[PDB]
Design a protein around this ligand. Sequence first.
Ligand SMILES: [Mg+2]
Ligand SMILES: [Mg+2]
Ligand SMILES: [Mg+2]
Ligand SMILES: [Mg+2]
Ligand SMILES: [Mg+2]
Ligand SMILES: [Mg+2]
Ligand SMILES: [Mg+2]
Lengths: 347, 129, 147
Amino acid sequence: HIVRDVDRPGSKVNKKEVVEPVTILEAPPMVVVGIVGYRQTPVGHKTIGTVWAHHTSVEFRRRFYKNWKQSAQLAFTKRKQFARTTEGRLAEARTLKAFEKKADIIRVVAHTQLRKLRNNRVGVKKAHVSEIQINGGTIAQKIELAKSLLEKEVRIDSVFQQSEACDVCAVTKGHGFTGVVKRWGVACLPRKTHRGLRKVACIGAWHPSRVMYTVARAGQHGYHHRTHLNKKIYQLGRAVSMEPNQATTAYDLTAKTITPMGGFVGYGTVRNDYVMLKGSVAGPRRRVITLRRPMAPQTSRKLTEKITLKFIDTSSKIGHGRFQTKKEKSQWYGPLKKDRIRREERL
Amino acid sequence: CRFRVSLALPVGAVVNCADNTGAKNLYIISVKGYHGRLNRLPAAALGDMVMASVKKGKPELRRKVLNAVIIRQRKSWRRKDGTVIYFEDNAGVIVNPKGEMKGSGIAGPVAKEAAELWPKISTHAPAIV
Amino acid sequence: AAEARKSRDDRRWKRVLAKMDKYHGVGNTRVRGCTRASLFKRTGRKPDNIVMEASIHLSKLLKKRTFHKRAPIAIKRIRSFVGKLMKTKDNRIDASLNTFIWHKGVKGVPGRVRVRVERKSETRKHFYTVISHIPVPSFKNLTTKVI
RNA sequence: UGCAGAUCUUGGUUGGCGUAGCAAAGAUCUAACGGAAUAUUUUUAAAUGCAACGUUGGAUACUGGAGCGGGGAAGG
RNA sequence: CGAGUAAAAGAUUAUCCGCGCAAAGCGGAGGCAGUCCGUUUUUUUCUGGGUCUGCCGUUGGGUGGCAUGUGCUUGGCGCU
RNA sequence: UGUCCCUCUCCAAACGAGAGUACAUGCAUGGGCUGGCAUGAGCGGCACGCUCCAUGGGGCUCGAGGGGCACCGUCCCGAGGCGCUGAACCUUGAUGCUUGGAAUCAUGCUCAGGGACU
Ligand SMILES: [Mg+2]
Ligand SMILES: [Mg+2]
Ligand SMILES: [Mg+2]
Ligand SMILES: [Mg+2]
Ligand SMILES: [Mg+2]
Ligand SMILES: [Mg+2]
Ligand SMILES: [Mg+2]
């Protein structure tokens, strides 16, 4: 959570400080490897083809195998031997011509870099691959941008701004097989009920002679896909190796990073670029999340406000944290018994 | 209007009377501005006007329905600045339907949430908290 | 010849990085450009008869277990721990170790235990292990050893 | 002296079905021996013989004298 | 074995690629010898040199870019 | 050439199914960090006690309601208190951090993985 001053004329909280919880998401740069074009038909959109980058990393090609280490590792081998030959250049020029003539949508195939995200609890080593659409301009201009962004890295600062909003496509935390009280929120029955309380008493009338799809039943809860629009960006950070003072504010000159004391519980250190979003986000820690540019109109006063942070909390999330940095702890306690022994051994 | 605070006082609660009208406690009958919901009891928080009856005190104030305002509550609530605060007891003062105090003094502190809504109560408060 | 060790990329990048070289985490001069497992020293198979000393953190194996099953469960866990290490299915428990596990009741198993493990072969050859108890005053700065 | 049914009579067979279950009285562990019940592979050792039984020593525990103690009547 | 593309556009899809409107028109293409096949129009293949544009895999050494242990691009070695 | 089973991990999980890893700081043990509780056993009482200052030399500080032997001192029994002592212990397991910014991480085990189909 953070502290900031709110600018909102006509409100009882105007020009005062508030406390708002936030979410931290690690954002290593992505790599673009492909271009796909779509044409519109009376039955829907159909893919025209794909243009590949001729140079792919090991973590990208891991996605095509279930046991990569004990395998021949032959993916994309023939394409590499053929792409730059005279027949190879002609074939690519043919596909690009079809993109120009008969396409309405241009997208790029991109994958994350799990080697740079040096996380100990994320066990997967094969990259996550997805498609990202290019908006704006004409078809000719769209293709030019896609070709320029081939084999290169894309940073999150080039896609989003500091005080904008975004959408959060994610998958919810799982709960397994759960009953109607937790799954749907129905009332519990009186203490005297024979054969149990946590149930729906009547699941239908005599007619129609069947159970309808609108009645609550027990089953799977959680692990669903949601969208949850209109989440405001509060900060666009950079990697701790290049900018050590991540959580330092103009109103708080302490030098500290975004990682709490003792690390994020179950996750660890944030060693990469990151985004700070206001509020909550679906899913547990370590899950991969997609952020999208908004669909709803962004002309409201709440969505156009400029955010200036004042204080970022970095106390330990284990127990009741009460120190902001490690120096605060070493100033409250003086030298301890173990420090004295180390000094005595140094003598 | 005001920001929402935790409810803390369902119908049937008995709270102290903080003015000097001769009443000792108040029994909450209902809360103003409650839109119903099946099986849910109306509940009153700080700065809420309630309908109440006196169960202890001068016989002249008893056996009739009055108006009152809640000024202290034991259930903690969170302010917009992130602070959680609570009192030691629940209390209220007898008031007329317009909002003017029947008494002339108040014992104990008065919540800031109740003070801004009712200007007359702000005058007689020993302390605004 | 299916090994195909190659491994010529590590040296070519090492001499490259020596030229252009803040950059604390990328300066090779652990070792960069190689896995930790590749530096493990590979000798032949170990002899048939070996002796090892190790500690087992039992409290992390018995958390929120039913109270009156903790001593019997700790016996099966110790057998599985040693069996995977020594590749054996015959693991004798010995009286000193059995008494120590049960010496505080069925539900008061100690948090840690230090054991001595010896593997023997008898005769197709048959391998079995004998596990005994090592009483120690403190469990600090104690690490697995092979004699 | 001719059977398809009488909630027909007597035998046999049958889906349900390897299903419902076999949940009061707290509980067993270890080594050696016994046993056909093993350490059973020909197509290094673990990933190809599991699971279970009795006695003795050792450990742990229950009954707790209105006792799963020691003797009798009735009944057997 | 009962053959229908929200596909292309031609010696009946065969007998090459690029630009162009199912146009007018405008550009590019390596030579030699053998075997086995051959009812024709420089017949259909298979090798060996035969000189190679465009490529794959290298060597170090100088650059240089990317977020920085992992891939690249420029400049020469021979090389498939 | 690939997929699955046994073995390993948990964002998944009634069983199936899932996300993963395939000699990997992968697993085990230890050290630091971050937290929880609230000051361990033992010894002691103008001193090789404890603390501070510049091995040695100098400044500190050292209880107890009561009772009992042995011609006043000495020796004892005594709940509690003080010092060594923010000590001692626990800290990832149905599953907190750290071997790559600066300020910390270190050892041990792997030795042609085995099996079923296409
Ligand atoms: Mg009943
Ligand atoms: Mg917490
Ligand atoms: Mg009702
Ligand atoms: Mg008949
Ligand atoms: Mg059953
Ligand atoms: Mg008993
Ligand atoms: Mg008896």
